[PDB]
Amino acid sequence: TGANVTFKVKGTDKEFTVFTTRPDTLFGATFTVLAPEHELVDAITSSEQAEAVADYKHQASLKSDLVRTDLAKEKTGVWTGAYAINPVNGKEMPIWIADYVLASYGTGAVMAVPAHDQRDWEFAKQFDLPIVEVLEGGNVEEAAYTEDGLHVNSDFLDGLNKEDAIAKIVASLEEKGCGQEKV
Ligand SMILES: CC(=O)CSc1ccc([C@@H](O)c2ccc3c(c2)[B@-]2(CC3)O[C@@H]3[C@@H](O2)[C@H](n2cnc4c(N)ncnc42)O[C@H]3CO[P+](O)(O)O)cc1
């Protein structure tokens, strides 16, 4: 079981939805990543980034799913030039494309939580993106912390465990109309 979370694209009437197994880490989402093949990419890419996005989409189409999701391969990607809006606090999150996100799985878009997801962490370290701890237990600048722990830096989720935080965040999202549990 997981959840869908919907993000508005800043400065537009566009939105996209991600699939996440950990809606409770929403306050640690410091960027979002679309599959290079995602349907929204071309419409939100800025003119300055357009050529780099086109070049990267071509590169990504020449790699299989297995090579793209391989943990040992160097992370690659490019900024679209656009920002998503985090629904819980209104903060802007840069929208990247990266081939470790697969078009066919879930929605083809993720919220990136580099502190607590190994692939997001590798991407953030490769591209100097912020890393924000929301589950205590590790030292997230040195190593992704991929285990359970009490929530921090998470407003009304602070002090809760995974099961409680997930229930609370999903309730908040369903109530704003920008999230729901998904299986
Ligand atoms: C079921 C549980 O609670 C088990 S405790 C657990 C502990 C750590 C992690 C960790 O890693 C993690 C941390 C945070 C986030 C996650 C993960 B996220 C986004 C937020 O949840 C990911 C989601 O990003 C990513 N993802 C979705 N769509 C695609 C796609 N199209 N391409 C490539 N990646 C994609 O992967 C799904 C689930 O993956 P599953 O369905 O294989 O389980 C997790 C659990």
Curated annotation (Swiss-Prot):
It is found in: Cytoplasm. Disulfide bonds: none annotated. It comes from the Bacteria. Belongs to the class-I aminoacyl-tRNA synthetase family. This is Leucine--tRNA ligase. It comes from Streptococcus pneumoniae (strain ATCC 700669 / Spain 23F-1).
